[PDB]
Design a protein around this ligand. Structure first.
Ligand SMILES: NC(=O)C[C@H]1C[C@@H](C2=CN[C@@](Cc3ccccc3)(C[C@H](O)[C@H](Cc3ccccc3)NC(=O)O[C@H]3CCOC3)C2=O)c2ccccc21
Lengths: 99, 99
């Protein structure tokens, strides 16, 4: 589909069998979700944001559906204002910017 | 053009007689640029995300050129780690997300 930007590009994602609202964020290299439970082991990851660098938990090879499109990749979990879908997953679903 | 998301979607912008590199961010409501001088009045504002909040100066009705596309809108100026072109200006150049 084609998404205009007059409002926030919020979509429904599915992870761990549950639906959540998330933002398609081209300015984010990675995907960071609000506190939740994910399977497997995690590793430390430092990410830079508008207000500084913070520590988050990194889970790899996680199944996540974005607006119906299935993806499997790295998902970070930490104190984020909203669920952020970054470039790592946007590329998996074939998303591009156009103008 | 069609911009891939394999890398950060960076573009050249023209504002206040100077060329700058900026990140096209669908995840940002507004546009925020690193410290620079702009004409006209301004009002203080706080924007927050990963890492916390930063204080910025809000200038309205600012002329900007993004990839040869002219647009006018509010531009925030402050200690942002990178220049960010948000939805308020992305819409004006007809930028959309496609997948
Ligand atoms: N009101 C608003 O729209 C949000 C505020 C804050 C800031 C904001 C928008 N989106 C985000 C997320 C957000 C936060 C609150 C509400 C909606 C979305 C992320 C933004 O794209 C940064 C961009 C970035 C910052 C520093 C370095 C490099 C890129 N990327 C980023 O942190 O990537 C990291 C996290 C995942 O991968 C790594 C962000 O922090 C923002 C920017 C301009 C105007 C207003 C705002």
């Amino acid at each position: 589909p084609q998404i205009t930007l007059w409002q926030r590009p919020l979509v429904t994602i599915k992870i761990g069998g549950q639906l959540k609202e998330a933002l398609l964020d081209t300015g984010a290299d990675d995907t960071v979700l609000e506190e939740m439970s994910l399977p497997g082991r995690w590793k430390p990851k430092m990410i830079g944001g508008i207000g500084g660098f913070i520590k988050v938990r990194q889970y790899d090879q996680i199944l996540i559906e974005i607006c119906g499109h299935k993806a499997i990749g790295t998902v970070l979990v930490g104190p984020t204002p909203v669920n952020i879908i970054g470039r790592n997953l946007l590329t998996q679903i074939g998303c591009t910017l156009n103008f």
